[PDB]
Write an enzyme that holds these catalytic residues in place. Sequence first.
Site, PDB file in Angstrom:
ATOM      1  CG  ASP A 116      -2.120   0.886   1.123  1.00 26.50           C
ATOM      2  OD1 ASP A 116      -2.446   1.396   0.033  1.00 26.50           O
ATOM      3  OD2 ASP A 116      -2.754   1.114   2.174  1.00 26.50           O
TER       4      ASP A 116
ATOM      5  CG  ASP B 104      -2.707   0.589   6.670  1.00 25.98           C
ATOM      6  OD1 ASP B 104      -2.823   0.790   5.443  1.00 25.98           O
ATOM      7  OD2 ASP B 104      -2.883   1.479   7.529  1.00 25.98           O
TER       8      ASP B 104
ATOM      9  CG  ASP C 165      -4.039  -2.434   1.361  1.00 27.48           C
ATOM     10  OD1 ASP C 165      -4.104  -2.057   0.176  1.00 27.48           O
ATOM     11  OD2 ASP C 165      -3.449  -1.792   2.247  1.00 27.48           O
TER      12      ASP C 165
HETATM   13  F1  ALF Z   1      -2.924   3.946  -0.088  1.00 33.84           F
HETATM   14 AL1  ALF Z   1      -4.014   2.540  -0.088  1.00 33.84          AL
HETATM   15  F2  ALF Z   1      -5.139   1.162  -0.110  1.00 33.84           F
HETATM   16  F3  ALF Z   1      -3.873   2.430  -1.857  1.00 33.84           F
HETATM   17  F4  ALF Z   1      -4.138   2.640   1.688  1.00 33.84           F
END
Ligand code: ALF
EC number: 7.6.2.-
Length: 1036
Positions: free
Chosen positions: A422, A741, A745
């Site tokens: 992420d 997290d 995700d």
């Molecule tokens: F920055 Al993300 F799911 F893409 F927390």
Amino acid sequence: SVRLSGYCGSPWRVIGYHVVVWMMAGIPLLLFRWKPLWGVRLRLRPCNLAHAETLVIEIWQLFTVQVQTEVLRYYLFQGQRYIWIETQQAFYQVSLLDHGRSCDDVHRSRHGLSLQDQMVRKAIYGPNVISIPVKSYPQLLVDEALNPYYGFQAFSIALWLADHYYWYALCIFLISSISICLSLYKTRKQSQTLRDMVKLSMRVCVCRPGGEEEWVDSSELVPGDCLVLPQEGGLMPCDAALVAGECMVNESSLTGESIPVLKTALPEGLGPYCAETHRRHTLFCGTLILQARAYVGPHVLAVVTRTGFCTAKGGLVSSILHPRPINFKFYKHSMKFVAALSVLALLGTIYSIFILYRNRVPLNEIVIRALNLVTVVVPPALPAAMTVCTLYAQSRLRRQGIFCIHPLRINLGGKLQLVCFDKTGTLTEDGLDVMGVVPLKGQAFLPLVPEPRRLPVGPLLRALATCHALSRLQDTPVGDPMDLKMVESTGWVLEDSAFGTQVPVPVSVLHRFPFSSALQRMSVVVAWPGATQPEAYVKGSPELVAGLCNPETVPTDFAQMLQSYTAAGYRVVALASKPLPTVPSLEAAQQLTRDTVEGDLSLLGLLVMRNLLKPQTTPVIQALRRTRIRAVMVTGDNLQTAVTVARGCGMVAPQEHLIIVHATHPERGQPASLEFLPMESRSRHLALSGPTFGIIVKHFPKLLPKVLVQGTVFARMAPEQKTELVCELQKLQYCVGMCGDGANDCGALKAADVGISLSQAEASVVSPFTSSMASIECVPMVIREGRCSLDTSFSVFKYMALYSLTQFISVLILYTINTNLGDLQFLAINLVITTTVAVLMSRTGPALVLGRVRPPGALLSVPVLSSLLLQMVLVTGVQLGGYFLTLAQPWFVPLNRTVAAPDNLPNYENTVVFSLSSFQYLILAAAVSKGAPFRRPLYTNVPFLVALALLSSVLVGLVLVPGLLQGPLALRNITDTGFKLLLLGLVTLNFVGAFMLESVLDQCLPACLRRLRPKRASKKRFKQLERELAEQPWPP
Ligand code: ALF
Ligand SMILES: CC(C)CCC[C@@H](C)[C@H]1CC[C@H]2[C@@H]3CC=C4C[C@@H](OC(=O)CCC(=O)O)CC[C@]4(C)[C@H]3CC[C@]12C
């Protein structure tokens, strides 16, 4: 695919099966547990599925479930119900009974469900409990103690007791008891963790039809029942769809995201209700409702939709309880390894039968002399050693903060070849931190002000502290994190909506137009005491806001400053104000239209917000890329912000090109077009987008592998496209493991081979692994421990092989001279020395660095087999040397071949062979424990070093001290001391020889292995693609 098959019951076939299997042998049961389809076919007659009383569920895997009735005739597979739909004559799951009903039906069920219908829906959908099965200790014992391993162990116990080696049988029983208690403890611990995690039972008021609100248990809810939520709130018992008011749900238990969530009512319409489309209007199971409020009617209503294992928490727990098989097999050719080591046992048993025939042993005793030698090579402490390895791995992980739910995933965590990430919360800080706001002095930009507190009172500060939609939830502001941070920077506190000065009049909100994603802008009506007229503050996309601003107010350098800020990873929002000639009052303010406020603005300034990179992210990414473990960022943010983070966090060194690949949408008459536009600051990366990735998946499945083999930044990826990409990366034979997290995700943390949920509580269902830290420092802590565990397993298997072959060679050298190893000497060797060492050898932790050398994955590998064979040749050499050296001694007198052990025993030959063998075990135990480069060295776990030291000292006492334990063990008392020192010299020679041989193999043998026959090609698909790209780079 799946397949069903009905087996109408009959008792005669069942009793015949039982008597045949019980009377015949255990071998038919063994081949049954290896080939269960034949067993089930023999047990009972196939029948039509409408007459079944037993299913055969297939996934090809074989499962047997029982069809039960309450007409309703249903079966539970993996906890999911399936019912007998009479009209279709098939078993349709209960998740599909009402699946496909419209939001208008959900709103119609607002009045509730009558008890006469609630009983029917409770018969169909079952109780609203995630019933983790409770197994009593006898059931557990039947689960483990029926393993063919423990069956052979009990057979061996009986075999030895039939030979009057009572103490060795007690030894085998104690080791198998320890193994069973360990397996039972592991299983009970896992089941206790789960049952504790998913245990909720409460009393929730239920909307009966007609309006007589009734309180029932939380285990008697059914899809279609209407549920009223407490105004003060409480834990949620089952999935539901809101049909009144708004909610504040803390979904951390389900998606790992602890921030409060807004849950609005269900929008009406004839569109079938979906759990993902209307995911803003659904209250999931196990999530803690913070506070719920009802705008119409006295109470807030939720209409149940899923109960039991059908829910979201129920689905994740059904995945945890029954995990899908692991694709990557850790111990490759393990069966061929144990076969290439069982050929040795067979050759030795042939030698045994031959030499005992030559020794004129009774045939009834020859059968025992051969069965004992065969059962010697089956180590009683193999399951104990394996489960102790896994328990130590779990404990070492849990000691930092990483909480692996099922420990078999650590071995996968060892051989990772790709790691996704992420960005918000994982690499960069969770919340945006404002760099400041740049004010305007006429038609020019002023220097950036890091602290908005120092701004003089005026339109800019009032816009900063008021133009937002924060609300106090339990004496705490809640809303957009961006707006909340821009508020807290100003120092103002929320007290319609009024705000107090940090240190200067309070500011009131007369009216407010909520922000819209499509409009990408927002405006409010603001008034304060002492103001001639209220002012309106507008926040939104700076290019759109500047258009609404007066042309003479927007500075001419607006575009260049905007580009410089935006391309640097900053997030800039524009703030503008305009005077309103409306009289200051709430009555007239509420009539203002959004269009009137948005137009004719005057630009106040640009608010710049940065998402800082965690301090612990850059070292982890560098230590993942200098160990040849690809690092990928699967984010849902912008593409330029993602590219700037990745280039800042080490995923793209300054001298590695990053080629943004762009796919233009295929219009009418033209196909999709890939255009590569690079970036100016392994040797080449690609930064896709979400739509671009979807287009490349759909149109170009030929250019997809050369996009997932070198693509690094995957930005603007939707929560489903993260899982898409993880599966597509697993199709290239990567062992991808994602570390995210948030709630975006949790879709891919399941598809990834090793998912780590970064910020969690003690445990959660979101992903296999979790963690109790905020940085990605836990990806190396998982790879290091996975490598340590995957190497400890090989070390323990190698030690068990070497320790069985050594004991077997000893018993053979004794059978040749017509002796055995006695009764207490087997107990010593197989309990005090070997079991102790095998259960303390797994305690030494993982190394403190990540190395470029990946651990092996094969047990038949020529390093392992060369090591075993050379160690065994050395051990046999030392034992035969000891024997042939005790002959030449003057004080030597041969035993009485006229009788076998334990009659002739004690004698000099058994004494010498046992004295050497008991040292052989410790020497191989210290020789197979190799620290570098995976484990911490041997002496760094004091239990193992102290075990080796104490056992070596005790055995040296046995060799040197006269009468020391030489009565119970039945060791002949050697009087000479020079020969004792010679035995100790032979032991030390073997010690040095084993260590030197292992060092020489581990160092030199890989070089000769490469030179003799270099690998022509690699089986890994991504490796073939990498070679194909290095030969000719794809994007020209
Ligand atoms: F920055 Al993300 F799911 F893409 F927390
Ligand atoms: C008769 C004598 C000479 C034989 C020696 C046997 C012991 C050295 C072995 C038998 C089983 C082993 C135990 C098996 C498993 C565990 C794993 C480990 O447990 C945990 O990880 C803690 C769990 C938690 O708190 O969450 C602690 C060591 C221990 C008890 C081992 C310690 C050493 C034991 C007691």
